[PDB]
Amino acid sequence: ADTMTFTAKNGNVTFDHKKHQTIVPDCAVCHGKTPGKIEGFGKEMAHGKSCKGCHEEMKKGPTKCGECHKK
Amino acid sequence: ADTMTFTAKNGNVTFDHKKHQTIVPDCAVCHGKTPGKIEGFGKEMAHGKSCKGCHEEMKKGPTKCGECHKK
Ligand code: HEM
Ligand code: HEM
Ligand code: HEM
Ligand code: HEM
Ligand code: HEM
Ligand code: HEM
Structure with a gap:
């Protein structure tokens, strides 16, 4: 729907803007x-x-490398 | 889903991979x-x-800087 994928050499990062x-x-x-x-x-x-x-401050969402960067 | 973002200092490029x-x-x-x-x-x-x-060879799609790079 409105998901943005940011490229990264160590694994792309998917961001659900709508969510x-x-x-x-x-x-x-x-x-x-x-x-x-x-x-x-x-x-x-x-x-x-x-x-x-934000994820760190709110204790919700990805904070470790592999939680965002998906090879 | 919906787009990829290629970050660039002169303006990020949005790419519809599915399209x-x-x-x-x-x-x-x-x-x-x-x-x-x-x-x-x-x-x-x-x-x-x-x-x-591809865009140049096939005469379809963006070939000018600002058609891809958007600030
Ligand atoms: C210590 C853990 C992490 C390491 C080692 C790491 C490593 C990297 C590296 C090397 C890049 C540059 C990629 C490139 O230019 O191709 C990058 C960019 C990025 N990282 Fe991480 N990362 C970590 C944690 C995270 C986390 C937790 C997130 C999500 C909340 C995240 C989101 C991103 C995003 C969105 C970009 C790309 C920005 C753009 O599109 O240019 N990273 N990371
Ligand atoms: C209703 C409130 C919001 C509106 C109206 C809005 C609007 C937008 C628009 C118009 C874009 C540009 C899309 C494009 O390049 O074509 C965008 C991108 C983006 N938004 Fe939002 N947004 C909102 C809330 C949020 C929130 C809460 C976050 C963070 C959690 C966020 C994070 C982002 C990011 C990371 C981008 C990509 C930026 C870039 O490519 O330079 N947005 N948003
Ligand atoms: C472009 C920057 C960001 C990236 C790449 C990112 C990435 C993610 C990812 C991958 C998830 C888990 C998948 C999902 O539930 O959608 C998530 C969840 C979450 N993010 Fe982000 N995020 C970003 C910015 C932010 C910001 C700026 C905030 C707070 C202001 C935020 C707050 C949250 C929260 C509260 C969740 C938990 C969702 C849930 O438990 O259902 N995020 N984020
Ligand atoms: C159905 C055929 C295709 C499949 C299954 C496919 C699959 C994928 C996958 C899995 C990724 C993420 C790779 C990663 O981990 O970084 C990706 C990224 C990408 N794809 Fe495709 N793709 C297809 C067609 C295309 C076409 C036709 C183009 C060029 C017009 C293209 C250009 C790209 C680009 C530029 C990326 C981002 C760079 C990267 O992440 O490697 N793809 N594609
Ligand atoms: C003469 C016109 C153009 C100029 C001056 C220009 C300039 C640049 C520059 C300076 C970068 C490197 C950005 C950085 O390292 O931060 C870049 C990368 C890139 N440009 Fe262009 N550009 C032009 C035309 C185009 C066009 C027409 C397209 C699309 C078809 C395009 C797509 C890209 C992409 C995808 C990247 C890679 C961004 C990444 O690393 O993910 N450019 N360009
Ligand atoms: C990652 C590399 C590429 C980037 C960043 C890129 C970017 C774009 C953009 C911004 C558009 C206009 C918006 C849209 O219609 O989606 C477009 C259209 C188009 N691109 Fe690409 N492109 C890439 C690779 C390619 C390649 C390799 C081909 C051919 C093999 C191609 C063929 C086309 C065509 C035929 C259109 C026209 C779509 C239409 O008329 O509706 N592109 N591209």
């Missing part, structure tokens, strides 16, 4: 004031606040 | 013998035969 919208109901959490592309998105942001950091 | 699976004759066109991770995939391959080259 995340259903459970994080404020776009601004991920996008600030402009839902759309996230400037700079890549490894550093994904391993920080844009992906892994 | 390409449908219209492009055989997985081997992009994957060789077996579908799996495309070793080396990146700028050189994308600007060559893996992406842009």
